[PDB]
Design a protein around this motif. Structure first.
Motif, short mmCIF file in Angstrom:
data_model
loop_
_atom_site.label_atom_id
_atom_site.label_comp_id
_atom_site.label_asym_id
_atom_site.label_seq_id
_atom_site.Cartn_x
_atom_site.Cartn_y
_atom_site.Cartn_z
N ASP B 150 7.17 -6.99 -5.56
CA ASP B 150 8.56 -7.41 -5.37
C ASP B 150 8.80 -8.78 -5.99
O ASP B 150 9.51 -9.63 -5.44
CB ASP B 150 8.97 -7.38 -3.90
N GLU B 186 3.65 0.04 2.10
CA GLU B 186 4.96 0.64 2.35
C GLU B 186 6.05 -0.39 2.61
O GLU B 186 7.23 -0.02 2.66
CB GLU B 186 4.89 1.61 3.53
N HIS B 188 6.88 -2.73 0.57
CA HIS B 188 7.31 -3.29 -0.70
C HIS B 188 7.69 -2.18 -1.67
O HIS B 188 7.25 -1.04 -1.55
CB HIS B 188 6.19 -4.15 -1.30
N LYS B 189 8.53 -2.53 -2.64
CA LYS B 189 9.02 -1.55 -3.60
C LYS B 189 8.31 -1.63 -4.95
O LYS B 189 7.65 -0.67 -5.35
CB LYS B 189 10.52 -1.72 -3.80
N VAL B 190 8.46 -2.75 -5.67
CA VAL B 190 8.01 -2.82 -7.06
C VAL B 190 6.58 -3.35 -7.13
O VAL B 190 6.30 -4.44 -6.63
CB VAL B 190 8.95 -3.69 -7.90
N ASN B 209 7.80 1.91 -9.25
CA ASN B 209 8.45 1.81 -7.95
C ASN B 209 7.73 2.73 -6.97
O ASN B 209 7.55 3.92 -7.26
CB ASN B 209 9.93 2.20 -8.04
N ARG B 210 7.31 2.19 -5.83
CA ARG B 210 6.67 3.01 -4.81
C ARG B 210 7.57 4.18 -4.48
O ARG B 210 8.78 4.02 -4.31
CB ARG B 210 6.39 2.21 -3.55
N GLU B 212 8.47 6.58 -6.36
CA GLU B 212 9.14 7.10 -7.54
C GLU B 212 8.14 7.40 -8.65
O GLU B 212 8.52 7.50 -9.81
CB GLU B 212 10.21 6.12 -8.03
#
Lengths: 226, 213, 11
Positions: B150, B186, B188-190, B209-210, B212
């Motif tokens: 992130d 889990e 965090h996204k990027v 991206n988590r 994706e």
């Protein structure tokens, strides 16, 4: 001609004892002084001990005095290192070495070394790895080539062997040196690059063998939708 | 005791170059100095004894010199068999060794191909997440790999491993593995690795991206 | 006094 073979290394827990042996052939072992030297990744080469030809004089490094005993049985052409109260800092490859030939010199080095035997001091128990795919994707592709692999996690002790497609796939494989995690267990990855057009039509399987735990794994690595 | 200070620590040289390794003893050792060559997985091999005497079978391109505190090992014309680690050893007062000089093959710059691998479903089931960033077939060895989660810079939760120079094309490959618990993963996204290398005109970032990928 | 670097071989 001149040959030294070290033996007796292994994975041992701290505080225990362990005896290394060095069998000499191809020269008159009974007439030569002999050495132990060890090498660790964070201390370089470190002399350990010397024993005179007849077994009389023995000298030791300050770090091992009292704990290590060098000895020899000239009737068997064998040098011995008795290691007691093993510490983590004793983790190293241990080499035996022959003293240099007699001459008019008053100081003596070494001339021939053995192959070395690895001693690992750890409290970790034997454990087989978990094997996870490193799946190829659009984030692992470059100019018609895709990378894929397997992650071989949490095993003890070294080593593991990895092959690909039961040995039929060797070009473009990189199997990295294992890393010791703070957990006390090892991990490594093995990667291979392949034509990205093969991903739909060629099966890729990493074959992992961990002999100490008698663990064998065949892991098919499938492409993701990424 | 006697300390041996060897330099440089690492040296990149082309075949046919003139290569010189120096060692300095902390006190005088007369000529009681030996030079060793070692290749991965093999025992050290004596090359020069008593500072300047060539051992049996060592080619004539090796030479050693020195007396007192300063010693040198020179390879006049570097051969493909000479890329290895070299160590000095004094033998006048016990036996102590230099830290080693790795002589590495010089070749042209090659920028790494950078790849990223999200953690597998299988590993996530097991409670942890490993993110792997792979730098493939690059030169020189110096490379900077930084994890950003992130856009927050990570430290202390990754480990790197590097191959030896490839026997064919003399390049390196490197993996960096970021390890988190599933719960932390889990949050965090990027997930991104940012690579800086001499072959790259600017630093390169690979990310996903988590969930994706 | 005994030199560890002295000749360790048969005299």
């Amino acid at each position: 001609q001149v040959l030294l073979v070290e033996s007796g290394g292994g994975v041992v827990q701290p505080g225990t004892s362990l005896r290394l042996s060095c069998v000499a052939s191809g020269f008159s072992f009974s007439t030569y002084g002999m050495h132990w030297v060890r090498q660790s990744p964070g201390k370089g080469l470190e002399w350990v001990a010397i024993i005179w030809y007849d077994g009389g004089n023995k000298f030791y490094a300050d770090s091992v005095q009292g704990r290590f005993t060098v000895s020899r049985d000239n009737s068997k052409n064998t040098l011995y290192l008795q290691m007691n109260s093993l510490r983590a800092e004793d983790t190293a490859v241990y080499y035996c070495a022959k003293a240099y030939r007699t001459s008019l010199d008053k100081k003596y080095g070494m001339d021939v070394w053995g192959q070395g035997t690895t001693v690992t001091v750890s409290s970790a128990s034997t454990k087989g790895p978990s094997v996870f795919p490193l799946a190829p994707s659009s984030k692992s592709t470059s100019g018609g080539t895709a990378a894929l692999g397997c992650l071989v996690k949490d095993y003890f002790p070294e080593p593991v062997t990895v092959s690909w497609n039961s040995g039929a796939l060797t070009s473009g494989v990189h199997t990295f040196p294992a890393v010791l995690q703070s957990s006390g267990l090892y991990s490594l990855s093995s990667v291979v690059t392949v034509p990205s057009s093969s991903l739909g039509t060629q099966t890729y399987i990493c074959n992992v063998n961990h002999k100490p735990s008698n663990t064998k794994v065949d892991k098919k690595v499938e492409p993701k939708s990424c | 005791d006697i300390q041996m200070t060897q330099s440089p620590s690492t040296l990149s040289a082309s075949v046919g170059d003139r290569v010189t390794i120096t060692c300095r003893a902390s006190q005088s050792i007369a000529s009681w100095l030996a030079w060793y060559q070692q290749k991965p997985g093999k025992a050290p091999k004596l090359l020069i004894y008593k500072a300047s005497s060539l051992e049996s079978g060592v080619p004539s391109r090796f030479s050693g010199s020195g007396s007192g505190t300063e010693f040198t090992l020179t390879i006049s014309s570097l051969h493909p068999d000479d890329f290895a680690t070299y160590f000095c050893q004094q033998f006048t007062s016990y036996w102590t060794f230099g830290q080693g000089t790795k002589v590495e093959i010089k070749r042209t710059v090659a920028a790494p191909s950078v790849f990223i691998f999200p953690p597998s479903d299988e590993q996530l089931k097991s409670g942890t997440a490993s993110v792997v960033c792979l730098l493939n077939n690059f030169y020189p060895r110096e490379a900077k790999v930084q994890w950003k989660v992130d856009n927050a810079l990570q430290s202390g939760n990754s480990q790197e491993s590097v191959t030896e120079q490839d026997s064919k094309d003399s390049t390196y490959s490197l993996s960096s593995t970021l390890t988190l618990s599933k719960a932390d993963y889990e949050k965090h996204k990027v997930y991104a690795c940012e690579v800086t290398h001499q072959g790259l005109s600017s630093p390169v970032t690979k990310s996903f991206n988590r969930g994706e990928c | 006094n005994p030199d560890p670097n002295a000749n360790p071989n048969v005299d």
